[PDB]
């Protein structure tokens, strides 16, 4: 199954700013119109998050990137993709990421979401592949080169089937897909949010809390993860299995959760509509001390009594 891709070019690591993204609902308490202070694993506001690309730049020896490095998991991850052609397909999570230990696979293979925990012998360069057939103008799922063996499976879920749109699109990124992953006491917890966007780079500023998606009772150690991307092949990408491919444009972003005290605002319906990262700056420390999003002195004059 495994193919080590060639023709990637060198590019320095790149970064962007997380603004106030990545807040998620840290519990399932029923709330209405209250602020709640809680210490949990959060992405600090205005974090320097790492920016990864799938891109094939025009020109002679134009930059060609298909970024699927193995990355640390640390205490949990914020993951965001900015998409127009459904290039990010999922992730693998584990330790050795080989047959010596169990790993978690979460992947959209164009017809199903697949969630499996096995002793996987993952490929060094795992990827999925789409083929564009010129004569009927059809984009079809063609390659699944993620692992060469899978043994002793302890968890398997396969969603109801679908047919995902695989067309490489023109224009700006249109879909923002955000995830928080935590691995707590044997449970792999996923929070997520999908948002319409219209941008070519960076992350949008507007606030959105990620909602609980699922808790997987899988009981495995996780210290590393690796993103699964789909490449494209066609009559325009001549070469062999390693070289005859291109990347449809996509970007994704990785930040790391750490222990933080956040003040969360729940509106009339229990939606988290704003948050303060208490340790961000003196203004945020002031808000958390006052248990308030507003710090301005009032004009009642009643302070002198109490
Ligand atoms: C990681 C890759 C990934 C892909 C390729 C993806 C595609 C994708 N997700 C959708 C909905 C959705 N997708 C999911 C969840 C998932 N769907 C998945 O493929 C995976 C792996 C998860 C989560 C682990 C959910 C719950 C919805 C409904 C969310 C909504 O519409 O608000 C839809 C149909 C509605 C739309 O266009 O917004 C697409 C095309 N989403 C992703 O997160
Ligand atoms: C891919 O490269 C790695 C490291 O260079 C090597 O160990 C592995 O055997 C290669 N696999 C294939 C299929 O070429
Ligand atoms: C983000 O972190 C990297 C790694 O240390 C650093 O090189 C880069 O300058 C940082 N960017 C900003 C804007 O602080
Ligand atoms: C995706 O995975 C499911 C579950 O393993 C499998 O049944 C299905 O055939 C796969 N899709 C394709 C296009 O191979
Ligand atoms: C397009 O043609 C290819 C090659 O004949 C075929 O595999 C594919 O199923 C076709 N797609 C459609 C939608 O007919
Ligand atoms: C399968 O994995 C589980 C968890 O790692 C382990 O307890 C069990 O012994 C394994 N079975 C094998 C390796 O045959
Ligand atoms: C995970 O690793 C820790 C120490 O690194 C160990 O105590 C624990 O038993 C491991 N769990 C599994 C399921 O292998
Ligand atoms: C809250 O719920 C009501 C209906 O119960 C709905 O009309 C409203 O849009 C929701 N959101 C806000 C911010 O009020």
């Amino acid at each position: 199954q495994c193919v080590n891709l060639t023709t990637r070019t060198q590019l320095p690591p790149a970064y962007t700013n997380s603004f106030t993204r990545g807040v998620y609902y840290p519990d399932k308490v029923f709330r209405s119109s209250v602020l709640h202070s809680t210490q949990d694993l959060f992405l600090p506001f205005f974090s320097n998050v790492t920016w990864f690309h799938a891109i094939h730049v025009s020109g002679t020896n134009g930059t060609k990137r298909f970024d699927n490095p193995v990355l640390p998991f640390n205490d949990g991850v914020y993951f965001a993709s900015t998409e127009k052609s459904n290039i990010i397909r999922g992730w693998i999570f584990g330790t050795t990421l080989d047959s010596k230990t169990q790993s978690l696979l979460i992947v959209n293979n164009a017809t199903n979401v697949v969630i499996k925990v096995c002793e996987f012998q993952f490929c060094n360069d795992p990827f999925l592949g789409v083929y564009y057939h010129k004569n009927n103008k059809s984009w079809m799922e063609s390659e699944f080169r993620v692992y060469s063996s899978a043994n002793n499976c302890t968890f398997e879920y396969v969603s109801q089937p679908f047919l995902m749109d695989l067309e490489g699109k023109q224009g700006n990124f249109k879909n923002l897909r955000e995830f928080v992953f935590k691995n707590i006491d044997g449970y792999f917890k996923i929070y997520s949010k999908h948002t319409p966007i219209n941008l070519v780079r960076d992350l949008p500023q507007g606030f959105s809390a990620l909602e609980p998606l699922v808790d997987l009772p899988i009981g495995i150690n996780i210290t590393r993860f690796q993103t699964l991307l789909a490449l494209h092949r066609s009559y325009l990408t001549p070469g062999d299995s390693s070289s005859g491919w291109t990347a449809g444009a996509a970007a994704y972003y990785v930040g790391y959760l750490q222990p933080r005290t956040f003040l969360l605002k729940y509106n009339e319906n229990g939606t988290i509509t704003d948050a303060v990262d208490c340790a961000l700056d003196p203004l945020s420390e002031t808000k958390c001390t006052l248990k308030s999003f507003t710090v301005e002195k009032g004009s009642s004059g009643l302070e002198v009594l109490f």
Side-chain angles (χ1 to χ4, degrees), residues 169-184:
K169 307 284 188 194
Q170 321 157 67
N172 301 333
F173 297 135
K174 294 293 163 63
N175 309 109
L176 172 66
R177 304 174 174 147
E178 300 175 277
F179 295 88
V180 165
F181 305 121
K182 286 160 45 168
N183 194 43
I184 310 293

Side-chain angles (χ1 to χ4, degrees), residues 107-114 116 141-142 144 147 156-159 163:
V107 62
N108 181 327
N109 70 352
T111 64
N112 303 91
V113 174
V114 179
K116 284 185 185 155
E141 191 81 347
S142 52
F144 184 86
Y147 54 88
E156 183 181 286
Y157 162 76
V158 176
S159 75
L163 200 51

Side-chain angles (χ1 to χ4, degrees), residues 18-19 21-24 41-47 49 78 254-258 260 262 277:
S18 71
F19 311 138
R21 306 212 68 83
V23 178
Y24 60 96
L41 292 173
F42 293 116
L43 183 67
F45 287 175
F46 305 105
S47 279
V49 300
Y78 168 77
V254 178
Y256 291 106
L257 314 176
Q258 58 187 89
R260 300 286 268 210
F262 273 36
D277 174 7

Side-chain angles (χ1 to χ4, degrees), residues 201-268:
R201 55 169 285 150
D202 307 314
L203 292 167
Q205 176 178 47
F207 185 88
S208 283
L210 280 57
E211 290 167 351
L213 181 64
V214 70
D215 289 352
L216 311 173
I218 62 176
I220 64 171
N221 275 332
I222 295 171
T223 61
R224 304 195 300 156
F225 79 102
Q226 190 178 17
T227 305
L228 304 177
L229 307 176
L231 52 75
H232 296 163
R233 304 186 194 264
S234 73
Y235 75 109
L236 300 153
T237 67
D240 61 16
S241 57
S242 78
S243 63
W245 63 276
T246 193
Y252 64 91
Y253 303 87
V254 178
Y256 291 106
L257 314 176
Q258 58 187 89
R260 300 286 268 210
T261 292
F262 273 36
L263 185 66
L264 303 172
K265 175 181 298 205
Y266 293 82
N267 76 348
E268 47 265 27

Side-chain angles (χ1 to χ4, degrees), residues 3-214:
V3 165
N4 288 329
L5 300 166
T6 61
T7 70
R8 294 181 171 95
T9 61
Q10 306 310 300
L11 198 66
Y15 304 93
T16 202
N17 195 302
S18 71
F19 311 138
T20 62
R21 306 212 68 83
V23 178
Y24 60 96
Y25 294 78
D27 64 42
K28 295 254 191 130
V29 176
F30 183 57
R31 298 186 175 90
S32 166
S33 308
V34 297
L35 310 191
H36 178 63
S37 177
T38 193
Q39 182 188 281
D40 210 320
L41 292 173
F42 293 116
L43 183 67
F45 287 175
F46 305 105
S47 279
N48 186 14
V49 300
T50 309
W51 172 9
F52 299 97
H53 325 257
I55 195 72
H56 194 169
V57 168
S58 60
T60 294
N61 307 158
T63 294
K64 194 180 179 179
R65 297 292 298 181
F66 191 67
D67 291 343
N68 57 357
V70 186
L71 300 169
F73 189 83
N74 284 319
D75 292 309
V77 160
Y78 168 77
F79 184 101
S81 62
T82 57
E83 288 262 29
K84 58 179 171 159
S85 308
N86 293 321
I87 301 301
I88 283 76
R89 299 295 199 75
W91 321 265
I92 57 186
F93 307 87
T95 51
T96 65
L97 298 183
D98 61 28
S99 62
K100 296 165 216 249
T101 59
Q102 299 260 329
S103 306
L104 169 66
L105 164 69
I106 301 178
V107 62
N108 181 327
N109 70 352
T111 64
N112 303 91
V113 174
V114 179
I115 302 170
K116 284 185 185 155
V117 177
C118 309
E119 293 154 25
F120 287 109
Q121 182 63 35
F122 290 120
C123 299
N124 175 73
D125 206 346
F127 65 84
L128 293 75
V130 182
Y131 179 80
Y132 174 75
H133 184 273
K134 188 202 199 181
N135 306 267
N136 56 12
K137 305 187 180 161
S138 164
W139 298 76
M140 60 194 119
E141 191 81 347
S142 52
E143 296 173 275
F144 184 86
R145 297 187 189 267
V146 179
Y147 54 88
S148 64
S149 61
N151 291 125
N152 189 24
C153 179
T154 54
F155 187 91
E156 183 181 286
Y157 162 76
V158 176
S159 75
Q160 62 265 58
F162 48 79
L163 200 51
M164 184 159 67
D165 184 1
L166 306 181
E167 181 176 33
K169 307 284 188 194
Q170 321 157 67
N172 301 333
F173 297 135
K174 294 293 163 63
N175 309 109
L176 172 66
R177 304 174 174 147
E178 300 175 277
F179 295 88
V180 165
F181 305 121
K182 286 160 45 168
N183 194 43
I184 310 293
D185 294 330
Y187 284 86
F188 191 82
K189 300 187 189 204
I190 309 183
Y191 310 76
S192 74
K193 185 66 141 137
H194 287 35
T195 304
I197 55 165
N198 182 26
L199 52 81
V200 275
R201 55 169 285 150
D202 307 314
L203 292 167
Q205 176 178 47
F207 185 88
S208 283
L210 280 57
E211 290 167 351
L213 181 64
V214 70

